[PDB]
Design a protein around this ligand. Structure first.
Ligand SMILES: NC(=S)Nc1ccccc1
Ligand SMILES: NC(=S)Nc1ccccc1
Ligand SMILES: [Cu+2]
Ligand SMILES: [Cu+2]
Ligand SMILES: [Cu+2]
Ligand SMILES: [Cu+2]
Lengths: 450, 459
């Protein structure tokens, strides 16, 4: 059986990528057995930090005390491994004693899986032993464990009135293009048609860019921000959070990231069982490649005077909702089996349900307010932009107590849709409208691979 | 026409990868025109640092004095742009005034890119966004990527040995004979047996690239000759091994001073950026790949691991390891640290090709002249030690040390297929210092993309 003639670029395939994702991050570690000792280190309260490049086959990391992995000087032990033919059943790496002035490995580690638990064996290489270890991968903390929404704001956000309102508001305009004339007349009869009667602004139909649906998108969220901000200080993201710094370049910055210290760390992609298309899609929008290919591209375009100045507010809103907005939700989504849109079991109403993937829960997420603020601030760049390329042709005006814009060349309509209040407990009306409409999570429904 | 229904992962295609490559790095910059001034900044002696992710469509960077771009505190101006619809005709970015405590753009920049025939030219007009007709222009020359010899200096004595016709022709011919052996006619082979240039023992030659290359002990010849070349080289200059393979460049986003340094190649070990070969997209994609950070993480780090893993090494005879390391990592280490040089043909012996300038890592006629060659061959050599230790662990005594042709080596055994390593005619010549004209002749018998590009495959 002949050996290879040459090397080829050998990027991790699915199994390597997912195994790397299981490994990547910070692990609590203890040594076990009568022979189990590393020189100058306790047997317990150790930590193991591991990293693998998005398509890496190589495994790096460090093994020291928690205060030392966070410290400036080199950790006592460095991990060097690789993941060739490695899986849940065999994971091998060497340790290097960085205090010994040699990179020659001092230990051969092997580990097995039984957010994940490694049971492992170490062999001293100076020997030709009962030396095991147990490693428990640390919790990736949820935004709610790090940005506290106060009792007043949270009470409003989790209320049935508000959960159902946010869902129905999205659902009516999202589905309108596909709804039968019988469905449309039902919604009209209970005041939940998306915008002006017999002239509705479907968000997802063939004319979505030109019908002014985009203005509804910007306005409703500006209105929601205005209310939320009256009860609590919720500053906008100035800049989109950068992907995690690789372990090789800033070991302490890499480790802090996994503590989600500001609530803005990207929660790791989860494997959706029996849906590989969903699994790849999610993996990609949560990736560093996606930041540089899509997210940074939006950050630049939507602060480019020449780019914004080519668009009506309607066109701008439609573009930003259809692209950046579903991607902001799933990129910052931590894990929920997804609630069916017309299921009003009491448990779905509890403060714990803050799933970014569903407008029923999305607004309960602290991170929702940070990127909706960034979105809302882009409306000011678009106005500055028209004020540059088209002075006077866009005019300010107050609408429903909210600073806004009068109709014009660049503002297709002046009656923005907030549901029945602008264009018409009875929480029951909204249940009935959701049921009429409905007869993978919400922000995963339009997924497309490249 | 209909707007998209959804976003999709929109990775850079070839033209956008290549543009980002032309943009990436440190540029010397001047402002020019009547109204051309940036707050707190001189008109001349400015630098512009750009980065784009390997498949990134976004453009980031900074504009301040050279001292400030290396400083801890934030640069005065920050670049944000994207390359959608961009080309050599139109690159656009906004500037952000980091002293302003606003991220709203203060300036709109429009640029044209020219190849040179510095390392490219960026030029065009800047508009103050505060203003509701100004002469505001700039020119940015990209700084040259410094070559390894401009950084690590091989001393007069050593340089003389390396550039000599004797040594260049030895190196090319030693590879060519064993690399081509399995393709050569019986007539070409007898001719080479004729001048004592057959690869190893007469009528039992160890071809390096034939179907039994892993099991015919060719591996030992590979390891032994480089070890022999290392001992000689090291007698004339301290040439320490790499302990660890250099990491890819730290992205600008995470370490701005580290990114800028990398492009000065300050230790001679920075990865010279890829060049486009005309009419050869297969070769251009290949070279781009093995210079990529993906390659580091996909292949180089894996080799770094495998060849220091006792359990991996202990499965292998010295010659299995030789064949395996040469055919994968060795040819890839050359071309990853290869800087730009038409490439010299094997049979062309023009004086100009002998100049010390000719240190191209892609051709054994020149590779040994590159300083970086001695760093990675020292590293290869050092893994022979990991391989010995590995056998002392799993097979104690089953491998024994032994001095051979003056060199600390290894006695033939279960795990050392042969005791007669091939240095050339000195050790195996049975024909009918080395003669230069005999070497030229041998190369003509064998030769009836650069050398280390000849066995490229894509995935
Ligand atoms: N960890 C995840 S979400 N898995 C995955 C699935 C397909 C492709 C790449 C990665
Ligand atoms: N700069 C180079 S070598 N070009 C290139 C070619 C194909 C794919 C990616 C990049
Ligand atoms: Cu939203
Ligand atoms: Cu919403
Ligand atoms: Cu070589
Ligand atoms: Cu060589």
């Amino acid at each position: 059986p002949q050996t290879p003639d040459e090397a080829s670029l050998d990027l991790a395939a699915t199994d390597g990528i997912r195994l790397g994702d299981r490994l990547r991050g910070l692990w609590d570690l203890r040594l076990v057995g009568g022979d189990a000792e590393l020189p100058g280190l306790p047997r317990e309260g150790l930590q193991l930090v591991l990293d693998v490049a998005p398509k890496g086959r190589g495994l790096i990391g460090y093994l020291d005390t928690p205060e030392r992995l966070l410290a400036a000087e080199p950790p006592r032990f460095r991990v060097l491994g690789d993941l060739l033919g490695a899986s849940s059943a065999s994971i091998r790496w060497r340790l290097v004693d960085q205090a010994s002035g040699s990179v020659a490995p001092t230990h051969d580690c092997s580990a097995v899986f039984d957010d994940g638990t490694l049971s492992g064996r170490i062999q001293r290489l100076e020997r030709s032993e009962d030396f095991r270890f147990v490693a428990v991968k640390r919790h990736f903390p949820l935004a709610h464990e790090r940005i506290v929404l106060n009792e007043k704001l949270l009470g409003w956000l989790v209320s049935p009135q508000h959960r159902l309102f946010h869902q129905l508001w999205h659902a009516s305009r999202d589905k309108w293009h596909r709804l039968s004339e019988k469905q449309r007349n039902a919604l009209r009869g209970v005041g939940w048609q998306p915008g002006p009667l017999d002239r509705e602004r479907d968000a997802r139909g063939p004319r979505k860019d030109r019908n002014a649906s985009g203005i509804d998108f910007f306005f409703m969220h500006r209105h929601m921000l205005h209310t939320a901000r009256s009860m609590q200080d919720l500053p906008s993201w100035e800049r989109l959070p950068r992907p995690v710094v690789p372990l090789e370049y800033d070991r302490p910055g890499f480790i802090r990231y996994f503590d989600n210290p500001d609530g803005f760390s990207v929660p790791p992609a989860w494997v959706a069982v029996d849906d590989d298309e969903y699994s790849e899609w999610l993996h990609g929008l949560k990736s560093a490649e996606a930041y540089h290919a899509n997210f940074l591209v939006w950050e630049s375009q939507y602060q480019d005077p020449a780019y914004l100045a080519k668009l009506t507010l309607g066109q701008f809103g439609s573009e930003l909702e259809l692209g950046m907005h579903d991607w902001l939700h799933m990129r910052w989504a931590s894990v929920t089996t997804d609630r069916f849109p017309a299921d009003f079991a009491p448990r779905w109403f509890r403060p714990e349900n803050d799933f970014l993937g569903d407008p029923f829960s999305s607004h309960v997420n602290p991170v929702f307010w940070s990127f909706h603020g960034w979105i809302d601030d882009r409306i000011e760049d678009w106005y500055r932009a028209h004020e540059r390329f088209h002075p006077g042709e866009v005019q300010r005006r107050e609408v429903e107590g909210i600073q806004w814009f009068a109709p014009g060349r660049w503002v297709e309509v002046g009656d923005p849709w907030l549901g029945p209040a602008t264009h018409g407990l009875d929480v029951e009306t909204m249940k009935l409208a959701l049921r009429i409409i409905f007869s993978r999570p919400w922000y995963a429904r339009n997924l497309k691979l490249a």
